């Protein structure tokens, strides 16, 4: 079949793969419980991305959706990855700053909406309605970034500077990477079809790997994960 984007699915599989192992090993050597908590979460994130990147490399998670007069290539496995990976990341951020149960619930729920409306949008046949769904998903994302920026940051000020520091970095990395997803989606295959599938896959692996292995590297080398 050899699709053009495959080289990127292969690089993503590999990066996600190397990251899950390194974290796994690091985490089972650690004895501190809290740190163990953070390790178990952060290692799972790329582990899942790894399976999905593998599937897509092997020909799964792809479907052709009709809209705009075309049979467009829609990688739906991505939402199968992000449905569980994005909330887990919010959780790491939530545990880092002592977020309350209610804040976490609303965050994940928001996240659930964002990924669901996003997939629904990527599956929609009427071109215009694709952007309606995309719109809701993005609005849901903004709520999440808001809580993380205004909420969390504020509560991270009750922690040690080392903890608030690790968090700001993590929060900052998240805000920049997440912000880029709706835009890639809008000018890509699910959207205006301006950017070709291959460049889009590369944009997505870069963000994905940056947001999971990048985020993890920073979180796990920090002494903030300890109780
Ligand atoms: C490891 C993957 C991560 C951290 C993925 C984050 C993904 C997003 C913030 C995705 C957002 C989307 C929208 C705001 C609307 C359109 C569809 C999505 C799912 C691409």
Curated annotation (Swiss-Prot):
InterPro entries: Arc/bac/fun_rhodopsins, Rhodopsin_retinal_BS. The chain crosses the membrane at residues 6-25, 40-58, 76-92, 104-123, 131-150, 169-187, 200-219. It is found in: Cell membrane. Disulfide bonds: none annotated. Its main location: membrane. Residues 59-75, 124-130, 188-199 are extracellular. Keywords: Cell membrane, Chromophore, Hydrogen ion transport, Ion transport, Membrane, Photoreceptor protein, Pyrrolidone carboxylic acid, Receptor, Retinal protein, Sensory transduction, Transmembrane, Transmembrane helix, Transport. One of its GO terms (cellular component) is plasma membrane. Residues 26-39, 93-103, 151-168 are cytoplasmic. GO terms for molecular function: light-driven active monoatomic ion transmembrane transporter activity; monoatomic ion channel activity; photoreceptor activity. One of its GO terms (biological process) is phototransduction. Light-driven proton pump. Homotrimer. Belongs to the archaeal/bacterial/fungal opsin family. This is Bacteriorhodopsin.
